[PDB]
């Protein structure tokens, strides 16, 4: 029943502040060390800070000393990361983890992570364009010009999953993301069977259903 759940992440301006939370269930954080570990886009794992909730003793990575403060409230079984003077370098998925067996079991439980994006760019919802067909046919949707990550794409509201390829987003020279989602289907169904890509960009509260026709 052991789990860790991070929250508090999102898009924030450089120079700004943000507080993350880590709620523990299935064990008492008074019993263990709690860590924050982060991972920048396309990079490896970097330890950020540690706390022993019982006495509040802390340790920090050099890269965040002074700017970040880790803390914990045992009565809420929850730990926090106060981030200040945020830099683009701080952009990352932030994970909460614990030391099992006073360190013997290493970091045995991790949360799902919360994405922190540090940028001065404004939120923008995507435009969704059809990739019209012309497993013998291919079709898709171009999900263009949005910020920040992430977006989700499904086909026919989840009814179509086989042969779907939703590509990783790439940052354009404009500083906006763009990606395509494609699927290969029988040519036989091109003139009748309806294909709709469902695009959700929660950061901009944008929801788009686009029908792709031949």
């Amino acid at each position: 029943e052991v789990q860790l759940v991070e929250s508090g992440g999102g898009l924030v301006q450089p120079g700004g502040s943000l507080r993350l939370s880590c709620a523990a269930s299935g064990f008492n954080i008074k019993d263990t060390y709690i860590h924050w570990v982060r991972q920048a886009p396309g990079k490896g794992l970097e330890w950020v800070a540690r706390i022993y909730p019982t006495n509040g003793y802390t340790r920090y990575a050099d890269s965040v000393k002074g700017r970040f403060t880790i803390s914990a409230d045992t009565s809420k079984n929850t730990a926090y990361l106060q981030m200040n003077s945020l830099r683009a370098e701080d952009t990352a998925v932030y994970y909460c983890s614990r030391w099992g067996g006073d360190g013997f079991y290493a970091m045995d439980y991790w949360g799902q992570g919360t994405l922190v994006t540090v940028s001065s760019a404004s939120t923008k919802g995507p435009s969704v364009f059809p990739l019209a067909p012309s497993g013998t046919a291919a079709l898709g949707c171009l999900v263009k010009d949005y910020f920040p990550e992430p977006v989700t794409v499904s086909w026919n509201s989840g009814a179509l999953t086989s042969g779907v390829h939703t590509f990783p987003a790439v940052l354009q020279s404009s500083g906006l993301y763009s990606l395509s989602s494609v699927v290969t289907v029988p040519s036989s169904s091109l003139g009748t069977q309806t294909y709709i890509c469902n695009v959700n960009h929660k950061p901009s509260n944008t929801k788009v259903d686009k029908k792709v026709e031949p």
Partner: protein, 213 residues
Amino acid sequence: DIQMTQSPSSLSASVGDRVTITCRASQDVNTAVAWYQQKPGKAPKLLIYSASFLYSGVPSRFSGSRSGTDFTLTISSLQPEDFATYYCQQHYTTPPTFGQGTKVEIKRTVAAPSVFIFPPSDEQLKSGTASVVCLLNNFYPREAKVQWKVDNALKSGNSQESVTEQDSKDSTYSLSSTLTLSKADYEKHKVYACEVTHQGLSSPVTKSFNRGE
């Protein structure tokens, strides 16, 4: 701080293969070493603790060993669901440090890409931009060459590529190449083509369309 030097940076092995990943600590860390597995979009998961102990629920094909400052993760029989990045970590001292990671892909036989080209939608043209998309579907290995030719002229610096993670079912990759032009420039040319070179293709495959036709 104590550095963890992990090798190789990446490796491809066929299913059933015995895989070896190495991590060398810059100084003595006793047995305070752990191994983690991380799949795309997911949190790391603990595989091995205290250098050689298999963690709860982890398959028996994973094992760890220590020899002085050298630590070894072994996968006795690589499975398709073992595609991931693996990390060593020491926690003998603070800060705990991670190895650079080892990306493990499944090796399979050559598979030629199925190629498709998509002209820009009329909707997008209205906004004043034209995106042209070339799709390479389900191929292996990952290495491929996609070249855009407009009116039989090599176009450079106007396209970006994206590649999917290795497919869990057939262990293939797919790739998109996207050419972006203004509506004005797009209307100045006729033939739009992507030429694809890949080990699975005897000769380069071209897909093209004529604008307006």
